Amino acid sequence: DFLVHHAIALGLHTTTLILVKGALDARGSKLMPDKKDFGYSFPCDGPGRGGTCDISAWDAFYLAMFWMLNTIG
Amino acid sequence: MNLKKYLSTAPVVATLWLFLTAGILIELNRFFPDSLFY
Amino acid sequence: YPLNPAVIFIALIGWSAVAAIPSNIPVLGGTGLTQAFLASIQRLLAQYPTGPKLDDPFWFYLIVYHVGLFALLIFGQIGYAGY
Amino acid sequence: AHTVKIYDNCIGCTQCVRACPLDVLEMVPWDGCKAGQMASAPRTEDCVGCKRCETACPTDFLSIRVYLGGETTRSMGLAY
Amino acid sequence: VLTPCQQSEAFHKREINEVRTLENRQANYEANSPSYLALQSQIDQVHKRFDKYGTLLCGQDGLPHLITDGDWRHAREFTIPALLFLYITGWIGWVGRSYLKYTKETKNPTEQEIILDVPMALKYMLSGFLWPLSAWQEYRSGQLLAKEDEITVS
Amino acid sequence: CAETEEKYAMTWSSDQQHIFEMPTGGAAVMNSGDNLLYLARKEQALALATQLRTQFKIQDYKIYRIFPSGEVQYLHPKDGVLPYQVNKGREQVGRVKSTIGKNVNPAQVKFTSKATYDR
Amino acid sequence: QVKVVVDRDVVPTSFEKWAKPGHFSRSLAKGPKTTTWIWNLHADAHDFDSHTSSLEEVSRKIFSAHFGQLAIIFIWLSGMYFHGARFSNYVAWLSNPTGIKPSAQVVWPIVGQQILNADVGGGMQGIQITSGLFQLWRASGIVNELQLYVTALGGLGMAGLMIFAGWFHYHKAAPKLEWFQNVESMLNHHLAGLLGLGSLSWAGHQIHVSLPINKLLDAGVAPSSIPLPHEFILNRNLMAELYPSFQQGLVPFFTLNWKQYSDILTFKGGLSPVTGGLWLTDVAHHHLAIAVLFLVAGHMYRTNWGIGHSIKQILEAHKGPLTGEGHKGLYEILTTSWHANLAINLAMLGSLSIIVAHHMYAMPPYPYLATDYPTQLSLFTHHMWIGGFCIVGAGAHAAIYMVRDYSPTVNFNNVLDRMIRHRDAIISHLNWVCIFLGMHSFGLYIHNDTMRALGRAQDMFSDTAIQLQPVFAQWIQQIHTLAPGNTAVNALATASYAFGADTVTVGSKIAMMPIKLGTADFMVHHIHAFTIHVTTLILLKGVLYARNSRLIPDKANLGFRFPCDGPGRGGTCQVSAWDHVFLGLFWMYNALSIVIFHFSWKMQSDVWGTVTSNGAISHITGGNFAQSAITINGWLRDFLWAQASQVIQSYGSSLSAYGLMFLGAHFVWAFSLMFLFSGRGYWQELIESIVWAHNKLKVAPAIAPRALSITQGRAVGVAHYLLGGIATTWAFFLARIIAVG
Amino acid sequence: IKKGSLVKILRPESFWYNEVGTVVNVETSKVLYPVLVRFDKVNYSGLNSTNFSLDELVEIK
Numbered sequence A: 001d002f003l004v005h006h007a008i009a010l011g012l013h014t015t016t017l018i019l020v021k022g023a024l025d026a027r028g029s030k031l032m033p034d035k036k037d038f039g040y041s042f043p044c045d046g047p048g049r050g051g052t053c054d055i056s057a058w059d060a061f062y063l064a065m066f067w068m069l070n071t072i073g
Numbered sequence B: 001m002n003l004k005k006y007l008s009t010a011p012v013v014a015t016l017w018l019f020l021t022a023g024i025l026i027e028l029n030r031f032f033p034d035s036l037f038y
Numbered sequence C: 001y002p003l004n005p006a007v008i009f010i011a012l013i014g015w016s017a018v019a020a021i022p023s024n025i026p027v028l029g030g031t032g033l034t035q036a037f038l039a040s041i042q043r044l045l046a047q048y049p050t051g052p053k054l055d056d057p058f059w060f061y062l063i064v065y066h067v068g069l070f071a072l073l074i075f076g077q078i079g080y081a082g083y
Numbered sequence D: 001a002h003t004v005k006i007y008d009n010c011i012g013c014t015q016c017v018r019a020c021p022l023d024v025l026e027m028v029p030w031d032g033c034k035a036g037q038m039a040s041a042p043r044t045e046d047c048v049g050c051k052r053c054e055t056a057c058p059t060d061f062l063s064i065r066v067y068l069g070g071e072t073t074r075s076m077g078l079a080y
Numbered sequence E: 001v002l003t004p005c006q007q008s009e010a011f012h013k014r015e016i017n018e019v020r021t022l023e024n025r026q027a028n029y030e031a032n033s034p035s036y037l038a039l040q041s042q043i044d045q046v047h048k049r050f051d052k053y054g055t056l057l058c059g060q061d062g063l064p065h066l067i068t069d070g071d072w073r074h075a076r077e078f079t080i081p082a083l084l085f086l087y088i089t090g091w092i093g094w095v096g097r098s099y100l101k102y103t104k105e106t107k108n109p110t111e112q113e114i115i116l117d118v119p120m121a122l123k124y125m126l127s128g129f130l131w132p133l134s135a136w137q138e139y140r141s142g143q144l145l146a147k148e149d150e151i152t153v154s
Numbered sequence F: 001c002a003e004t005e006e007k008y009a010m011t012w013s014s015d016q017q018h019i020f021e022m023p024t025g026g027a028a029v030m031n032s033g034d035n036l037l038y039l040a041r042k043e044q045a046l047a048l049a050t051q052l053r054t055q056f057k058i059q060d061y062k063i064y065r066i067f068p069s070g071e072v073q074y075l076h077p078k079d080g081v082l083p084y085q086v087n088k089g090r091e092q093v094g095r096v097k098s099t100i101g102k103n104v105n106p107a108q109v110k111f112t113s114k115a116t117y118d119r
Numbered sequence G: 001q002v003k004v005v006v007d008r009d010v011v012p013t014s015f016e017k018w019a020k021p022g023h024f025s026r027s028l029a030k031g032p033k034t035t036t037w038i039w040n041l042h043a044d045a046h047d048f049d050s051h052t053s054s055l056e057e058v059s060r061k062i063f064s065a066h067f068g069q070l071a072i073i074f075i076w077l078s079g080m081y082f083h084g085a086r087f088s089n090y091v092a093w094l095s096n097p098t099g100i101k102p103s104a105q106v107v108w109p110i111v112g113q114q115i116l117n118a119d120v121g122g123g124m125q126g127i128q129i130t131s132g133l134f135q136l137w138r139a140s141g142i143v144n145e146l147q148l149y150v151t152a153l154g155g156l157g158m159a160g161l162m163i164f165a166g167w168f169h170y171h172k173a174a175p176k177l178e179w180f181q182n183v184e185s186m187l188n189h190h191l192a193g194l195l196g197l198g199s200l201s202w203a204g205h206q207i208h209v210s211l212p213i214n215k216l217l218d219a220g221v222a223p224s225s226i227p228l229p230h231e232f233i234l235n236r237n238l239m240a241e242l243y244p245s246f247q248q249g250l251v252p253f254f255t256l257n258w259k260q261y262s263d264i265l266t267f268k269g270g271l272s273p274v275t276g277g278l279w280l281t282d283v284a285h286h287h288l289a290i291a292v293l294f295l296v297a298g299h300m301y302r303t304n305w306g307i308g309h310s311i312k313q314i315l316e317a318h319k320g321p322l323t324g325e326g327h328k329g330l331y332e333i334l335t336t337s338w339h340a341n342l343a344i345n346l347a348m349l350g351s352l353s354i355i356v357a358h359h360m361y362a363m364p365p366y367p368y369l370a371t372d373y374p375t376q377l378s379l380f381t382h383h384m385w386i387g388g389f390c391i392v393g394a395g396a397h398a399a400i401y402m403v404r405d406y407s408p409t410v411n412f413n414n415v416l417d418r419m420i421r422h423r424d425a426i427i428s429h430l431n432w433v434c435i436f437l438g439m440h441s442f443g444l445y446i447h448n449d450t451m452r453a454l455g456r457a458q459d460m461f462s463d464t465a466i467q468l469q470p471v472f473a474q475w476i477q478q479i480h481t482l483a484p485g486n487t488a489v490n491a492l493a494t495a496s497y498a499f500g501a502d503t504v505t506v507g508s509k510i511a512m513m514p515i516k517l518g519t520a521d522f523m524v525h526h527i528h529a530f531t532i533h534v535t536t537l538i539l540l541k542g543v544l545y546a547r548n549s550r551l552i553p554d555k556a557n558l559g560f561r562f563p564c565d566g567p568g569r570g571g572t573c574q575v576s577a578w579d580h581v582f583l584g585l586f587w588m589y590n591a592l593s594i595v596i597f598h599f600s601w602k603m604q605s606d607v608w609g610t611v612t613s614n615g616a617i618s619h620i621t622g623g624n625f626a627q628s629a630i631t632i633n634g635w636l637r638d639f640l641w642a643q644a645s646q647v648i649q650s651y652g653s654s655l656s657a658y659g660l661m662f663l664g665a666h667f668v669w670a671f672s673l674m675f676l677f678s679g680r681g682y683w684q685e686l687i688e689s690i691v692w693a694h695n696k697l698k699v700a701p702a703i704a705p706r707a708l709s710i711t712q713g714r715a716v717g718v719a720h721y722l723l724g725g726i727a728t729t730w731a732f733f734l735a736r737i738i739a740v741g
Numbered sequence H: 001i002k003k004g005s006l007v008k009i010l011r012p013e014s015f016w017y018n019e020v021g022t023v024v025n026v027e028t029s030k031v032l033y034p035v036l037v038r039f040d041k042v043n044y045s046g047l048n049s050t051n052f053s054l055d056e057l058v059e060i061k
């Protein structure tokens, strides 16, 4: 009970870390603050400014699906 | 002369500190093994 | 590019006759490399469904004769490279 | 088409046009900067949208911002 | 129910089972083998291992559980290494914060972090010993914190 | 293919028979006097323009865009001078008044066929 | 001509530039304004063709670096000889090898982990060897601890000569490029001098050490009555008793009466029925054949004396019509570009290591090697895995040639780029072969999977069902049965007992059994041809589309480790010639994971195990391959569910460290997926949202904390996917076969 | 205002937003973004050297 329930609270706070991340940095981040302009699930911003694989607010869904299946797992 | 600058870098002092505290843990777990109290 | 499609049978002269008279006895064929084959195909040529994996001189002298025969006809088309 | 817009941060250092391998970008003499230059994107019908311009855009934050719009034959970059 | 562990049955079942099970390898050697002396030392390190867990609480599992309430009868279980630990990484954290607010005002702060200035480093390593009433008195000056740093659009 | 897609035929001249690299691949013969070169897409062609121009002088070069109706186009240059160089003929399109920091919020653009920056 | 011009006092040897990290790259000597400088410091630590284009300075750097590598290898082998000396039970192992399990490493007694010291016999415990060092020492004739100590100290001596040699050949005597492009001499000394005198001198060691010693140990002499290899050369009399051709001296050699040397050297093949290894008469005779054959081979390269070839006049002479120019240019490619040489040598080195694995399982060349099955397994598996990775190194460094060091002026209409003219027709037919083999290598498994699951086992691909008996492999294996009487005239037994006669048993342990190949072994060979063709697809797509694709027609202008181009062309992620190597490492993991999952389960069903009274048979799974390899539930159940059971129940025992390196390797495997799936457009402002929490408490790090780059943020997903993925099968395999064999 | 002055920014898409920085060059020829300001730390383009207008020119004393 103790160890698993810490693992479940781990799963919840990670999954809400992803979701509240890509739901409050959904509008604007300091990598690119133009994220309100490209809509929700735009692919990227290209390799500029270090590289920009999965900056969109669709990464909150995208990564938090893996953490959702992990946690409900 | 400039060897002591190399012995002041990040990975070397990282090994000379994690090696040292690693030896604190191992030498503190040979002398007092199975330490769940205190 | 193949400007000379002249002769193929010069390999059949060129590979059988160099492999008939050297017997080199204590191998599978006590006769030569080809004499152990032409005798071991006429037993099977008249629509014989046999010739299993234990049929030695049909399969083995199939491949070892085709692998030198292919090589000598290919080298026969290399015999139209010096032109 | 992939709409390229070039804002008023464009101080005309021309790494954008030299960085675009499609010549959608050209430089226009614009008397509002020190170099007197400001980039333009007239031929966005050939614009791939590869954002190779935005890598080499040394402004504060991206004078030239590429918005991914239409997808024609040329703008998708298919060979056949 | 957490029985006191020195009298729990399955605990002493694990005592007999592990002393006997590890003892089964001890009859594989002669009376003066180095391995035989090593398993003498290991049997000693099992009886000491089970006598030194006497005041714990092993339940029906025969395995010593812990309690993290701060009951002050379980203080040597959790809260004494809790305060001990918080002292140790309060040490480490105040060392690292103090060294970064050193190298923030130097000549080149980039080269300061590759090559640690072991003079000033081992100054701050040892000087950050009393971080509650030094970090607290640097908090009362309004200096541990900051204000109006970087942020995104809103 | 060539009966339905815009073939890109790159026409240019040189002085000596050098050897460049195709965007299809491998080394090309590079006729010394004057040579045209059919291609498939524009990035191949201006990538070849970077392939030759950054090495040496290949000026008086531009692809005639063979659109499948039959005729040509001319883009690089149009006024005869190199694009990052500045000529006084080009009219700038594609600007706004300020940075992204004054672009409109997309809830002010929602249910309208506008952009997130036109204002 | 051939002359050696050497610069002296090239580089001063102070510790000054150690204080300047990234001294070497002017692109990277700016210092870290970001944390990406930290990882680019290590990603440019060995980009020697990115420091300076001057091939002289590069070539000095690499040639001095090889001595550092050989220094680490001599420290490694001196380590193995010392852990053989002080820590191993090798002296006691030499008495009864079939009872005593080999152990060197004796785990220090800290909390719990002293239980890893497995009581393997010999009176002294420690964790069990699977590397098979004791079999190479019994083959090499090392009797007692003294040769292990002394050979260890000579290993440190050669390690000192390689450190001092590399320092000596970068700093105070380093050569010119004209020394390096003198390549006919380099082949001339590596074919002859390295490999020729290596195999010849090793034939000296086997004839004057191993043949008397492993005749005495074959006779069962205890390791105290055995004389030293010392004492066999003071007099021929101790060897004329063992081999009575030593009495004649070298006189029948110089008169070419080599019939007299049938005692020392022969051509028997097979295996020793007593030791379970190869006949060292055959092995010493073999190294003589490599000796004379390679010393013949070395002398075909004209260097100073106008006798021999040059590579130029060879490659020009093959001016074939369908290639046009012939091989013109390859002597200028391979003597000016190092990365192309690394592509060829890593391809042939890796495929040699695979060849090593396949030749070691079926012709076990060391005495008592096929007796202890973990050393038989893991020396197949290990050499199979490095034998894999080096082929991806070929697929990478071929592309690193094609991106950096390609020049179309030297490389115009030859055999090379005429491929690249029709690389669509290369990669398209690899695409077809990959789909055709995927259907016909794995669709058969979904077929047998369904037909066994649908009850209709009459429609499977078993021996009872629709059979797929491999015709060609059984036929040529039947030829290998008929070798030693017919074609190998002077042989006695076959090339192996994986081919011909009845099994060889040593100590009631099956050393080698003739492997039967029916209708399941077939389909796994088509797995292997399939997943070999997919790696060939990704590693030829990585080379033919390396420099200028039709998607992106300027990749050499972008580089080798560039991540992408952009979202244009609808997204061009992962498109570089490095990214194909990123993919070929996962397919390396696939292809070799099912190679060893063919090996370690066909030879736990068809070869290994014990023998009982009246010569009766007993395998480990008990013939449970052809009725079970045909499906996947038979594969996963009957292999991965059943063979795991000795890794999983391994707690409380000495096999529990594999029970830790099993779960932790599942952790590292699963931990790679975080790097593979996400990207730095997430992690960069996740991290910067943490940088707010450092800027609030003034703990802002002065080196700015970026996330990883893209190519690092996928290279690390490879290097965890492979470390965790490989260490799972490592712990699974050694915990499987140590628990029984 | 002048060169060398330590200037906080008030533009939300500046990477150095609410961070002080040093002034390198000011042009008085009606350039819309004349005040070139570089910084200690570094944005994602690797480049500390940017420029600003006059409304985003807030100094410290």
Ligand code: CLA
Pocket: E092, E093, E094, E095, E096, E097, E099, E100, E116, E121, E124, E125, G689, G690, G693, G694, G697, G699
């Ligand atoms: C200078 C030392 C230092 C200090 C005082 C802090 C302090 C803090 N970090 Mg942290 N951090 C550090 C280094 C440091 N960090 C390093 C080096 C890394 C990279 C691994 C991180 C990564 C990190 C993350 C990812 C997160 C924090 C967070 C936090 C906050 C919550 C506490 C926590 O869980 O820490 C976390 C502690 C760790 C992740 C491990 C400790 C890091 C190293 C191992 C110890 C640091 C000692 C330092 C290297 C000594 C160098 C100086 C010395 C040589 C002179 C707290 C303000 C969290 C936050 O925002 O909460 C509000 C958060 O999510 N940190």
Ligand code: CLA
Pocket: G063, G066, G067, G070, G179, G180, G182, G183, G185, G186, G189, G190, G192, G193, G194
């Ligand atoms: C017959 C002479 C000879 C021999 C034995 C070797 C042997 C070797 N060369 Mg080599 N080489 C030679 C001539 C020779 N070379 C010549 C003439 C050239 C110039 C054309 C080169 C150019 C060359 C390059 C460019 C490279 C090598 C490398 C290697 C090593 C491959 C690794 C290996 O197999 O480890 C097995 C290790 C051994 C068998 C130990 C060998 C040590 C013995 C004592 C022989 C060494 C004698 C030494 C060369 C004499 C120098 C004379 C000097 C002392 C006055 C191997 C040591 C590679 C390497 O790793 O660099 C070192 C490498 O990159 N060689």
Ligand code: CLA
Pocket: G266, G267, G268, G269, G270, G278, G281, G282, G283, G285, G286, G289, G290, G293, G359, G360, G363, G364, G365, G488, G493, G494, G495, G496
């Ligand atoms: C008469 C000398 C001689 C002897 C006694 C051996 C003995 C052995 N070799 Mg062998 N070998 C030899 C010459 C010899 N070799 C030559 C000349 C080559 C190079 C072509 C090889 C290449 C070779 C490889 C690649 C391997 C062995 C292996 C073995 C061992 C397996 C046992 C067995 O039945 O093999 C009997 C050996 C043979 C049937 C090989 C015959 C090779 C003939 C002599 C080649 C003649 C060269 C000539 C140019 C003709 C080439 C074309 C020809 C086929 C028509 C055994 C110790 C295997 C091993 O390592 O064991 C684990 C192994 O993998 N050998």
Ligand code: CLA
Pocket: G430, G431, G434, G435, G436, G437, G438, G439, G442, G443, G446, G534, G537, G538, G583, G586, G587
């Ligand atoms: C288990 C997961 C999985 C599967 C099935 C595949 C399958 C495939 N990959 Mg692959 N891949 C995977 C994971 C997987 N990959 C992963 C994890 C990576 C990460 C690195 C890659 C990376 C990768 C690369 C880089 C490449 C491939 C390629 C291919 C194709 C090889 C050609 C072939 O085998 O065709 C045969 C197809 C199969 C064996 C799939 C099963 C088909 C069954 C047998 C028949 C059809 C089923 C059914 C009847 C359909 C009809 C019913 C339905 C319509 C309702 C093949 C489709 C290559 C490619 O593009 O093709 C050449 C290629 O270049 N893969």
Ligand code: CLA
Pocket: G439, G440, G442, G443, G444, G446, G447, G450, G459
């Ligand atoms: C790709 C591998 C593969 C193969 C070879 C087979 C083969 C077979 N399956 Mg099958 N199956 C597969 C995958 C495969 N399956 C998968 C992946 C599934 C699950 C989705 C199933 C599910 C399944 C079921 C449920 C059943 C079968 C059954 C069968 C059998 C009869 C099907 C039939 O009539 O064939 C149709 C064949 C053709 C239409 C022929 C087309 C292919 C020809 C040969 C190509 C020739 C081209 C030629 C070479 C061109 C060159 C020459 C030219 C240039 C002149 C047959 C043995 C049935 C059975 O009872 O088994 C006995 C059955 O009930 N299968």
Ligand SMILES: CC1=C(C/C=C(\C)CCC[C@H](C)CCC[C@H](C)CCCC(C)C)C(=O)c2ccccc2C1=O
Pocket: B014, G674, G675, G676, G678, G679, G680, G683, G706, G707, G708, G709, G710, G712, G713, G714
């Ligand atoms: C987690 C993750 C990160 C974040 C990884 C962070 C940046 C690295 C964390 C480990 C480093 C090494 C921590 C640095 C700590 C130093 C070692 C100092 C600590 C003190 C001692 C240990 C020496 C990425 O940058 C990334 C990029 C692209 C795709 C996926 C990912 C990704 O999944």
Ligand code: SF4
Pocket: A043, A044, A045, A046, A047, A051, A052, A053, A054, G563, G564, G565, G566, G567, G571, G572, G573, G574, G679, G710
């Ligand atoms: S970031 Fe991801 S998407 Fe944007 S370019 Fe690099 S790879 Fe393609």
Ligand code: SF4
Pocket: D009, D010, D011, D012, D013, D014, D015, D016, D017, D039, D056, D057, D058, D059, D063, D064
């Ligand atoms: S915007 Fe950036 S890149 Fe485009 S011109 Fe002005 S400065 Fe050069």
Ligand code: SF4
Pocket: D004, D019, D020, D021, D022, D024, D025, D047, D048, D049, D050, D051, D052, D053, D054, D066, G568
């Ligand atoms: S969008 Fe792609 S093509 Fe158009 S400019 Fe920016 S980078 Fe060059």
